Amino acid sequence: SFSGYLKLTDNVYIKNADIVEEAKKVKPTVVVNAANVYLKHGGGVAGALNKATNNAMQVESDDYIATNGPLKVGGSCVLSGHNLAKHCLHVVGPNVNKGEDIQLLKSAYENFNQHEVLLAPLLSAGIFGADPIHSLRVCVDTVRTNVYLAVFDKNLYDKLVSSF
């Protein structure tokens, strides 16, 4: 039921949209969160998704970390999607503003291949400090399953499409 997306490749689609409003409308099987290793959803996409769940995402995430410990950079976990989706795939891309290695971005996108279809943001972009044009290139060259990318900033969406 995804609508208004521009087809970039056989399996990658993109739209200028707020991933929160997109999730509420579609209720996809999987929404991807741009997580950190501690699942502390303070800002960016994670802060927005968590606020839309009335903090239920953060309560579930704190129980997951108390049991399992932190994720790896490049890793992921599957938790509830709450009121937004059936599942939330929390994926940790490298944070360049914390000095993490951009080379781990391909490993982060490989987590998407475990799900037939996903609603997602660009990993390591925004407050994680990587170049979004690079993040879209790694996405297209790594993900083989059907990915619907929601880009919040209109100016960035136009730059990503015009330079693809």
Ligand X SMILES: O=C(O)[C@@H]1CCC[C@H]1c1ccc2cnccc2c1
Q: Rule CB under 6 A: say whether 121 interacts with ligand X.
A: yes
Among residues 60, 156, 161, 164, which is the contact residue for ligand X, using CB under 6 A?
A: 156
Residue recorded with tokens 């709450």: 82
Q: Identify the residue whose tokens are 């409308």.
A: 25
CB-based contact 12:143 (threshold 8 Å):
yes
Per-residue CA distances from 100 to 27, 95, 97, 149 (Å): 32, 5, 8, 23
Stretch that binds ligand X, among 1-9, 18-26, 62-70, 93-101 (CB under 6 A): 18-26
Q: How far apart are CA 83 and CA 123, in angstroms?
A: 22
Taking CB under 6 A as the rule, does residue 60 contact ligand X? no
Q: Is 19 in the site for ligand X (CB under 6 A)?
A: yes
Structure tokens that stand for 1 in this block: 């039921």
151 binds ligand X (CB under 6 A): yes
Give the one residue of 87, 126, 136, 140 binding ligand X; rule: CB under 6 A: 126
Say how far apart CA 83 and CA 34 lie, in whole Å: 18
Shortest approach of ligand X to residue 105 CB, angstroms? 12
Contact between 122 and ligand X (CB under 6 A)? Answer: yes
Interacting residue ranges for ligand X, rule: CB under 6 A: 18-20, 34, 44-45, 48, 121-122, 125-126, 151-153, 156
